[PDB]
Amino acid sequence: GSSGSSGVVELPKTDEGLGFNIMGGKEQNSPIYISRVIPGGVADRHGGLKRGDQLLSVNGVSVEGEQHEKAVELLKAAQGSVKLVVRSGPSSG
């Protein structure tokens, strides 16, 4: 579905956690993505974030072109609910 939203993942902000890990952050010259996912966390339950999904932007903030630290800050910046955008588009397509 070219026309529309790539796929914004809005998860409920709760101390409990999201259930997703991220590695990198313009440190090793690699894009930000989900390193590991909890088989029993909010994310897994929701159904949208999986190991590999590249983080495009969070809370309406471009992260792709920023250091890990930034990402972390954004997540905290949110309140009640966060917005994690990802790209599920096929490398070829």
Side-chain angles (χ1 to χ4, degrees), residues 6-87:
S6 208
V8 50
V9 178
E10 207 210 54
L11 303 153
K13 186 79 209 288
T14 60
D15 188 333
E16 272 314 314
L18 292 298
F20 81 72
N21 297 287
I22 53 178
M23 71 150 127
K26 205 88 158 157
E27 284 284 51
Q28 69 182 276
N29 180 247
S30 276
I32 300 169
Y33 49 71
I34 305 293
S35 66
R36 205 269 166 73
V37 181
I38 320 299
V42 179
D44 165 82
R45 302 159 69 84
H46 182 291
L49 302 168
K50 287 160 188 288
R51 169 181 71 274
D53 300 27
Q54 197 195 358
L55 188 78
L56 290 177
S57 305
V58 180
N59 281 280
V61 179
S62 311
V63 296
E64 287 275 298
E66 291 309 323
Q67 210 90 354
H68 191 148
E69 292 296 337
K70 170 64 89 79
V72 177
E73 303 309 290
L74 308 173
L75 274 159
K76 301 150 80 209
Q79 270 207 336
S81 50
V82 292
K83 270 170 187 85
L84 309 157
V85 178
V86 300
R87 191 175 188 203

